[PDB]
C-alpha cells in the first residue's frame, strides 16, 4: 500500500540549503526506496523505523545541489525472495529555488486570478500555496510590454517562480508572497 | 503572515555587549529561518546572522567569533547576543523571517532598533 512523503520545511529549496524528506506508512515496511526523477536519477534505501504502528525514514538533503532537484517518489519494501514493493507514493517536487530574478506576482465566492511577470524570457512560471506540497504550473506568452507572463485560475499566502525548458527543477527566486483573504 | 519587533538596542562603549531580541506573532515560528541584518549610515543593508529552522547558525564573516544568534520556540523570539563591539558596529539592527521550503527570500521585517557604540 502507497506510503506518505513530504518534504520539511517544504519542498523549494535554496542552492547549498538543506530538506528532509519523509516516507511513512502504517503498513510496517523494513525498508523504504526513495526514487528520483531527473537530470540524475537515483534511488535510495532508507531503513524503515518502526514506532507505534508507524514505519518513518528519513531522507536528508545537507546541501541542495542541481543533482538533487527532481521529482521524488516512496516506496515501501514488502519482500525479498517474491520480490515485492508497494505502490509508489504520490509524487513529490524537490526544486532548487533562488537562482534568477523574482518575478512579480498580481492579484467570498468570487474567482480570483494571479498573474506571474517578469522582463526575463521563462519558460515556465509556478504558482505555489504557502504549505502545500504541490505546485500548479504553466507557460509563459510575451506582452507588448516586453513582459512574458501567466494567469492562474484560482475559482492562502501565494508566491511567484520562473524556470526555463532545459531545467525544469531550477526555479528563480520567489515573487514578495501575495495574502489572498 | 509575520510581524516582528526587535528590542535592546541602545549605546555601549567600545568592547562592550548588548543583547538585542526579536518577538514574532505568527504561526509555524519553528519552521522560519530567523535573521539579524544591520544598515550602518551611508551603508546598504547587510546580513548580520542567521538561525535555520533546524537551530544551526551562520555569521558574516565581520560578526564572526564575538555574536551569538539564539532562538526560543517556546516564546517565538529570536537573539543577537553581541560582545567585544567597536564603533565599525554602529547600525539600526533588523530581525527578518524567512519562510524555508517556500521562500527564497527574508519576506518579513521589524522595523529596527539603534545600536550606537560611541566613540
Known amino acids: 500500500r502507497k506510503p506518505s512523503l513530504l518534504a520539511h520545511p517544504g519542498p523549494l529549496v535554496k542552492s547549498e540549503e538543506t530538506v528532509i524528506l519523509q516516507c511513512w506508512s502504517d503498513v510496517m515496511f523494513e525498508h523504504f526506496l526513495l526514487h528520483r526523477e531527473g537530470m540524475f536519477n537515483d534511488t535510495l534505501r532508507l531503513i524503515g523505523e518502526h514506532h507505534d504502528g508507524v514505519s518513518k525514514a528519513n531522507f536528508s538533503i545537507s546541501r541542495m545541489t542541481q543533482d538533487l532537484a527532481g521529482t521524488y517518489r516512496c516506496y515501501g519494501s514488502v519482500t525479498h525472495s517474491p520480490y515485492q514493493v508497494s505502490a509508489p507514493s504520490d509524487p513529490l517536487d524537490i526544486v532548487i529555488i533562488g537562482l534568477y530574478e523574482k518575478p512579480s506576482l498580481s492579484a467570498a465566492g468570487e474567482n480570483v486570478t494571479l498573474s506571474c511577470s517578469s522582463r526575463s524570457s521563462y519558460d515556465m512560471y509556478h504558482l505555489s500555496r504557502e504549505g502545500e506540497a504541490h505546485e500548479r504550473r504553466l507557460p509563459a506568452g510575451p506582452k507588448v510590454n516586453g513582459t512574458f507572463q501567466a494567469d492562474f485560475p484560482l475559482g492562502g499566502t501565494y508566491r511567484c517562480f520562473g524556470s526555463f525548458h532545459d531545467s525544469p527543477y531550477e526555479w528563480s527566486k520567489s515573487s514578495d508572497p501575495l495574502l489572498v483573504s | 503572515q509575520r510581524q516582528l519587533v526587535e528590542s535592546g538596542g541602545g549605546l555601549v562603549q567600545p568592547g562592550g555587549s548588548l543583547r538585542l531580541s526579536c518577538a514574532a506573532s505568527?504561526?509555524?515560528?519553528?519552521?522560519?529561518?530567523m535573521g539579524w541584518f544591520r544598515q550602518a549610515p551611508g551603508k546598504e543593508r547587510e546580513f548580520v546572522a542567521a538561525?535555520?529552522?533546524?537551530?544551526?547558525?551562520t555569521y558574516a564573516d565581520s560578526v564572526k567569533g564575538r555574536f551569538i544568534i539564539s532562538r526560543d520556540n517556546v516564546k517565538n523570539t529570536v537573539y543577537l547576543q553581541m560582545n567585544s563591539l567597536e564603533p565599525e558596529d554602529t547600525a539600526v539592527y533588523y530581525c527578518?523571517?524567512?519562510?524555508?521550503?517556500?521562500?527564497?527570500?527574508?519576506?518579513?521585517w521589524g522595523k529596527g532598533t539603534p545600536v550606537t557604540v560611541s566613540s
Open positions: 527578518a523571517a524567512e519562510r524555508t521550503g517556500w521562500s527564497s527570500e527574508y519576506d518579513y
Open positions: 538561525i535555520s529552522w533546524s537551530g544551526g547558525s
Open positions: 505568527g504561526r509555524s515560528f519553528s519552521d522560519y529561518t
